[PDB]
Amino acid sequence: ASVYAWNRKRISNCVADYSVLYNSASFSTFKCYGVSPTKLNDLCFTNVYA
Amino acid sequence: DSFVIRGDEVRQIAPGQTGKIADYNYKLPDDFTGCVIAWNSNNLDSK
């Protein structure tokens, strides 16, 4: 999408595996604020919104 | 400590870092009293 009208996707009812994302070295940045990306495989949530 | 890596990975050589070099190849202690010195070698180590 274009940034003036950005997409949003609810992620729910599922098992995540954030190492698949965090190990994808193609990502030019992976900045995190309220979490360390390493902890995302233990920590869990009502929903994630992308 | 002397070695070569891809320039993308120099970020991993610091205390508290994580990633396949920072864990699986070269790990600093989190209270590391020292200096990290690095430069490109595309004139020497590329062929």
Instruction: Give the CA count within 13 Å in the CB-facing half-sphere of A34.
Output: 3
The total number of residues shown for chain A amounts to 50
Using DSSP's 3-state secondary structure scheme, residue A10 falls into strand
A41 at B interface, C-beta within 8 A: no
Record the resolution, in angstroms: 3.3
Surface-to-core class of residue A22, CB atoms within 10 Å of its CB (0-12 exposed, 13-18 middle, 19+ buried): middle
Structure tokens of A34? 């309220």
Chain B closest CA to A14's CA: distance in Å? 26
Distance CA B41, CA B43 (A): 5
Contacts of residue B20 in chain A, CB cutoff 8 Å? 23
Tell me which chain B residue has its CA closest to the CA of residue A29. Answer: B8
Method used to solve the structure:
cryo-EM
Locate tokens 């495989």: which residue? Answer: A41
Q: Are A25 and B8 in contact (CB under 8 A)?
A: yes
The bridge status of strand A48-49 relative to strand A10-11 is antiparallel
Number of H-type helices and E-type strands within chain B: 0, 0
